[PDB]
Amino acid sequence: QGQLYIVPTPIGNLADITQRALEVLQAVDLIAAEDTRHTGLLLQHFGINARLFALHDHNEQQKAETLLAKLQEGQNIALVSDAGTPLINDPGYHLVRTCREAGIRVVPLPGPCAAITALSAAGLPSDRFCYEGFLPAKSKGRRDALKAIEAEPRTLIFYESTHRLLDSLEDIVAVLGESRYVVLARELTKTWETIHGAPVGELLAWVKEDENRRKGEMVLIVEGHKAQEEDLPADALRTLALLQAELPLKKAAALAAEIHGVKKNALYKYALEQQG
Amino acid sequence: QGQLYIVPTPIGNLADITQRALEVLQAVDLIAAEDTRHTGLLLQHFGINARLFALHQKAETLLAKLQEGQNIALVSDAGTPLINDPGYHLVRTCREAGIRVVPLPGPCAAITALSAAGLPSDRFCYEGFLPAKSKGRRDALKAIEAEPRTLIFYESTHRLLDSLEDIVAVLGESRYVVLARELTKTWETIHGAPVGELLAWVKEDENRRKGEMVLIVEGHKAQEEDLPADALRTLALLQAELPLKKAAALAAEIHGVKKNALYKYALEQQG
Ligand SMILES: CCN(CC[C@H](N)C(=O)O)C[C@H]1O[C@@H](n2cnc3c(N)ncnc32)[C@H](O)[C@@H]1O
Ligand SMILES: [Mg+2]
Numbered sequence: 289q290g291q292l293y294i295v296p297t298p299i300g301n302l303a304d305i306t307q308r309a310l311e312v313l314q315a316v317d318l319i320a321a322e323d324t325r326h327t328g329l330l331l332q333h334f335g336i337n338a339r340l341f342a343l344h345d346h347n348e349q350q351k352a353e354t355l356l357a358k359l360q361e362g363q364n365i366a367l368v369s370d371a372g373t374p375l376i377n378d379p380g381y382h383l384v385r386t387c388r389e390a391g392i393r394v395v396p397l398p399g400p401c402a403a404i405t406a407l408s409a410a411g412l413p414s415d416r417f418c419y420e421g422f423l424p425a426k427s428k429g430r431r432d433a434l435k436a437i438e439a440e441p442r443t444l445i446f447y448e449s450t451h452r453l454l455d456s457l458e459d460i461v462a463v464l465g466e467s468r469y470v471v472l473a474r475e476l477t478k479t480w481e482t483i484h485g486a487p488v489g490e491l492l493a494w495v496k497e498d499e500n501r502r503k504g505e506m507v508l509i510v511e512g513h514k515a516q517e518e519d520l521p522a523d524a525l526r527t528l529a530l531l532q533a534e535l536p537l538k539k540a541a542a543l544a545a546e547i548h549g550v551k552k553n554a555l556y557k558y559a560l561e562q563q564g
Numbered sequence: 565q566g567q568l569y570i571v572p573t574p575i576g577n578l579a580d581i582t583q584r585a586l587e588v589l590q591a592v593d594l595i596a597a598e599d600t601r602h603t604g605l606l607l608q609h610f611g612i613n614a615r616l617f618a619l620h621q622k623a624e625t626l627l628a629k630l631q632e633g634q635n636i637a638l639v640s641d642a643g644t645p646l647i648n649d650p651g652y653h654l655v656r657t658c659r660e661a662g663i664r665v666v667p668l669p670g671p672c673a674a675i676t677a678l679s680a681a682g683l684p685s686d687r688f689c690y691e692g693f694l695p696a697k698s699k700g701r702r703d704a705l706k707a708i709e710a711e712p713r714t715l716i717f718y719e720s721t722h723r724l725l726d727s728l729e730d731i732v733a734v735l736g737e738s739r740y741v742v743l744a745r746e747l748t749k750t751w752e753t754i755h756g757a758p759v760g761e762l763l764a765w766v767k768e769d770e771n772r773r774k775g776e777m778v779l780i781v782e783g784h785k786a787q788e789e790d791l792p793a794d795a796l797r798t799l800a801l802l803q804a805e806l807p808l809k810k811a812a813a814l815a816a817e818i819h820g821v822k823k824n825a826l827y828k829y830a831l832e833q834q835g
């Protein structure tokens with residue numbers, strides 16, 4: 289019977305909270321939080337007292353049923369995360385789905401979002417964009433993920449940690465090339481806030497100039513691929529290379545052209561250039 | 565020497581304004597908005613006076629003012645500014661001119677709708693307003709039919725029925741769609757259901773299509789198992805050339821299909 293509230297929290301600047309959020313927090317009986325201690329400190333700063341429930345992804349589903357039962361009893365539950373808004377790389381998906389399928393009102397509240405905040409000042413097209421969150425921590429997985437989105441024409445939003453910023457930048461340089469334009473937004477809404485846009489190679493070089501520039505939390509905005517059709521499809525080239533490894537060059541090119549339905553002369557020229 | 569500020573505005577709830585935004589508005593001596601009337605009404609409700617600037621080149625004037633040393637705050641009618649509209653060129657020019665841009669967190673209709681829709685969020689794409697023309701809308705839907713990420717669109721009450729019919733025609737009926745209406749207000753309503761069921765539900769009453777809407781559509785992540793004729797012909801061609809096992813592996817890696825299936829199919833054909 290009681291409604292669930294998705295109340296965002298500041299992303300580092302306490303002053304960046306909404307009045308409605310404070311009223312809702314003081315008007316609810318239980319607050320599901322990623323880390324009770326953290327939220328507890330935030331509540332104390334505003335002089336708000338309420339019950340805290342440890343709700344994180346590890347025990348999300350397990351306690352989703354308990355939260356649903358509590359809501360059915362007429363209680364009001366507000367969901368908060370350490371920062372930004374829940375459900376965006378933060379726990380809450382299973383609980384929200386269970387509440388929705390059980391016929392429970394869900395009241396979302398506007399609030400801070402690191403990706404949106406970075407995009408607003410990114411200086412890049414915002415009409416269409418794709419959010420991807422964190423990148424794989426492994427080199428092979430990261431390279432595969434980057435390759436899969438190499439041809440994406442929309443602006444790309446990624447989340448990044450100081451622990452792997454240099455490796456991720458190097459992988460981006462290797463895959464997407466240094467010509468791509470990338471914007472790094474660090475410590476938004478904080479004293480050391482800094483947004484720097486540049487070619488990937490230039491960006492990397494600038495970051496390596498000082499360790500201070502890769503400290504804290506970061507968001508990466510990658511300009512989408514340009515609308516150039518001169519380059520032939522990469523899948524055809526990969527198939528041609530694999531068939532060359534397994535079969536003779538001429539048969540490999542003929543089979544690749546036949547399956548992909550592309551001109552054989554261009555594929556043969558590319559293969560000859562690669563071999564040379 | 566001046567600093568540009570991005571100050572998101574409420575989206576239909578005056579209580580959704582943050583303290584930092586109010587302090588920034590007081591601090592800046594010139595506020596630039598697209599719709600002067602809306603921002604003026606917001607300021608009067610908050611009892612704020614300032615030198616409003618109207619947007620319609622204005623980029624050069626704003627850059628000159630910023631270079632002079634005047635703090636300018638950029639605002640929009642609702643939500644976060646410079647989203648689904650031009651203006652990012654000005655931010656890029658200011659960054660290239662040594663100016664410092666301070667974004668402020670604020671309301672976002674798409675993010676707010678996504679946080680409550682319950683559809684997957686680990687990865688999503690925002691497509692903004694769909695084409696107002698039926699042919700354009702159908703072409704856009706076709707271009708994103710195979711997208712596996714959750715899609716977020718903005719729609720107006722005028723074309724909500726047309727958009728729903730277009731999605732029904734293109735994406736079919738089995739697809740799950742969530743409609744968010746009048747978020748952050750007494751009329752807020754989020755309803756999730758198949759496209760056809762949602763269309764019937766919205767047609768059942770007129771108030772359900774009143775205002776501005778946010779549409780969240782789950783990506784295509786089902787019925788991906790099949791045996792395309794291209795894979796079969798490739799396997800047949802490679803079998804005569806390479807050993808069955810090698811041909812099956814090559815076909816599987818080319819078409820991204822299970823190798824063991826192709827092998828069983830080849831054996832059944834041979835049999
Ligand atoms: C792009 C122009 N945009 C401004 C929102 C801002 N740009 C933002 O990013 O949040 C206007 C569009 O956003 C949607 N919208 C705004 N407020 C809404 C609300 N309370 N409920 C539902 N939808 C809403 C709706 O589709 C409207 O036509
Ligand atoms: Mg922790």
Ligand SMILES: [Mg+2]
Nearest residue numbers: 322369370378
């Ligand atoms: Mg968290």
